[PDB]
Amino acid sequence: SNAVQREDGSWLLDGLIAVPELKDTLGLRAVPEEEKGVYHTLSGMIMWLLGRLPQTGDITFWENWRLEVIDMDSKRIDKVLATKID
Amino acid sequence: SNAVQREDGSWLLDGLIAVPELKDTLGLRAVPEEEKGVYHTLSGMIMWLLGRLPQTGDITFWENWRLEVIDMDSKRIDKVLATKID
Amino acid sequence: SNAVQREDGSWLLDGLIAVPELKDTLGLRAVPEEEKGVYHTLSGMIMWLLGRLPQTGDITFWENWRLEVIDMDSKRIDKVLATKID
């Protein structure tokens, strides 16, 4: 599970991307609930920040980043667009 | 149930604007909980996204839009400013 | 307690800044739950808007402001960056 950067520097990210790779790709300093083992995946993280099942169209925010749900894979996010804030 | 486009592209919308007219106005692909008979107006969609009673000053997000609650009629939203994020 | 403006015009705010100073500093029309006595500081306000204990990295929104949690002091927010959205 993957990360591709686009011709404006925004990221198209697979929802199943794991926390260590996600932090690397986005330069995150932390994730919410770190070390508590609540979720292990970008999709889970977004679900946690939303406090409910995400839907395509949903937007959340974390550190320097706007996270938009681009597509679902039933109970999980398939694809996310990550855009730098500013 | 009006909408009115300001000088800068942004939209002033009635909170009782129905979902059909809302998709058409803002070019929304979808709405949350579509076909689940959960809300029928922009006011109810904003309330769903916030997961609580809206207040004037509240900001929510969906697709390419920032939706700001500009005015209330007691419990229901009366005016909403929609702005397209980039 | 206090508020310092960066050269870019954004504000670093102490989490314990009280409602009157906050409104004056950011030119707020209101704050949520005004005169309900729910919270009395910026930290309490953001905790109210998130619906849970804030974490460093969280972002919330009110009126024309993006509110980023910069640092925590255990149960309370220590520092916030407020940036005018437009």
Q: Are B76 and B7 in contact (CB under 8 A)?
A: no
Comparing CB atoms, the residue among B51, B57, B59 nearest residue C29 is B57
| Greatest Cα pair distance in chain C | 35
The C-alpha atoms of residue B80 and residue B77 are separated, in whole angstroms, by 7
Residue A22 to chain B, least CA–CA distance (Å): 22
* A15 closest CA partner among A64, A76, A85: A76
Q: Is B53 near chain C, with CB under 8 Å?
A: no
| Helix and strand totals (H; E) in chain A | 2, 5
Experimental determination approach used: X-ray
Specify the DSSP element, H or E, that contains C80: strand C76-84
Q: What angle do CA A33, A36, A40 make, to 5 degrees?
A: 80
**Pairing verdict, β A59-62 and B11-14:** unpaired
Residues with Cβ within 8 Å of C4's Cβ and at least 6 positions away in sequence, in order, are: C11, C12
Tokens found for residue B18: 């129905």
| Reported structure resolution in angstroms | 2.2
Which residue blocks in A1-86 are alpha helix, DSSP H?
19-26, 42-50
CATH of the domain at B33: 3.30.465.10
Structural domain total, chain B:
1
B57 and C63 within 8 Å at the Cβ level: the answer is yes
* B64 closest CA partner among B1, B4, B9, B21: B9
The C-alpha atoms of residue B69 and residue B43 are separated, in whole angstroms, by 9
Q: Which domain holds residue B79?
A: 1-86
Residue B73 φ/ψ, nearest 5 degrees? -105, 95
Specify the DSSP element, H or E, that contains B59: strand B59-62
Cα B10 to its chain centre, rounded Å, is: 12
The C-alpha atoms of residue A58 and residue C7 are separated, in whole angstroms, by 33
Cα A9 to its chain centre, rounded Å, is: 16
Residue C55 to chain A, least CA–CA distance (Å): 7
**Other beta carbons less than 10 A from residue C22's beta carbon:** 21
| Helix and strand totals (H; E) in chain C | 2, 5
Facing residues of B42 across strands? none
**Other beta carbons less than 10 A from residue B79's beta carbon:** 17
How many Cα atoms sit within 13 Å of B69 on the Cβ side?
30
Buried b (16+ CB within 10 A) or exposed e, A47-84: bebbeeebbbbbbbbbbbbbbbbbebeeebbebbbbbe
In the β-sheet with B59-62, what is the strand arrangement from edge to edge?
B3-5, B11-14, B76-84, B65-73, B59-62
Q: How far is CA B70 from CA B48, C35, C75, in A?
A: 17, 19, 32
Specify the DSSP element, H or E, that contains C45: helix C42-50
